[PDB]
Ligand binder design. Structure first.
Ligand SMILES: Nc1ncnc2c1ncn2[C@@H]1O[C@H](COP(=O)(O)OP(=O)(O)O)[C@@H](O)[C@H]1O
Lengths: 136, 107
């Protein structure tokens, strides 16, 4: 359909959002999320969207590159576990974000973590969010 | 069994160049407190240490730490010979290098 009036018109309404050629952004609506990849802009690489700015949208959808999915689980996709999220983040920040440091210091990092709770409480969700947001 | 032949023992202080003996043990070999003493080990090894007087130790036993025993290739309770040599003099230059197996990751 007319994706323009469906998504982009509310997205750029009254907001002077800077836009760079080649990037991607996510628009949430219609009980789903849509990724839009910017193709071109008049002012070289970066520009500011204005009410008088023309927005061209005609064309076939682009093919996904090596860039990761923007709908994957993150720290914002988990709720009510702030203390446990902080504990897991402080337990896994050193071995994951700074791995080679543990070849130097010689201190053994934590290895085994057991999450327990009622079924459906979100253990797999927390694990996936931690893995994705640390690049592991 | 000459008086300069003793049995090693584990020490309380973990200094790598300190050996504790009872004063009566040192009296038989003219050893004085704070002197420099040579010790002969096994498999043609030997070390040099300094001496401290401790009354808790006994005459047959001599107290050392793990590093000295590893250098001497001996174990706890073994028999060693202790000699004295005043030729140990102040040195001008000593060249020391670390072991590759332990310095991994630190530069
Ligand atoms: N704390 C939470 N916040 C948001 N969604 C949750 C939470 N806990 C569970 N869910 C939802 O439940 C669904 C499945 O739960 P799951 O993690 O598989 O259960 P379990 O932790 O028993 O394996 C997930 O799709 C997730 O969206």
């Amino acid at each position: 359909g007319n994706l323009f009036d469906a998504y982009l018109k509310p997205y750029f309404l009254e907001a002077y959002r800077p836009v760079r050629k080649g990037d991607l952004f996510l628009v949430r609506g219609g009980m789903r999320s849509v990724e839009f990849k910017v193709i071109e802009t008049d002012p070289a690489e970066y520009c500011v969207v204005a009410p008088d700015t023309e927005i061209f949208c005609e064309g076939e959808p682009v093919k996904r590159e090596d860039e990761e999915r923007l709908d994957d689980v993150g720290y914002d996709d988990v709720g009510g576990v702030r203390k446990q999220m902080a504990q897991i983040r402080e337990l896994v920040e050193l071995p994951l974000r700074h791995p080679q440091l543990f070849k130097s210091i010689g201190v053994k990092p934590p290895k085994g973590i057991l999450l327990y709770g009622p079924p459906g409480s979100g253990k797999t969700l927390i694990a996936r969010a931690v893995a994705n947001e640390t690049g592991a | 069994k000459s008086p300069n032949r003793l049995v090693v023992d584990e020490a309380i202080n973990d200094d790598n160049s300190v050996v504790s003996l009872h004063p009566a043990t040192m009296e038989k070999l003219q050893l004085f407190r704070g002197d420099t003493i040579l010790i002969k080990g096994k498999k043609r090894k030997d070390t040099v240490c300094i001496a401290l007087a401790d009354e808790t130790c006994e005459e047959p036993k001599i107290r050392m730490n793990k590093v000295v025993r590893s250098n001497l290739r001996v174990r706890l309770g073994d028999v060693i010979s202790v000699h004295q040599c005043p030729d140990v003099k102040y040195g001008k230059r000593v060249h020391i290098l670390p072991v590759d197996d332990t310095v991994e990751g630190v530069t």
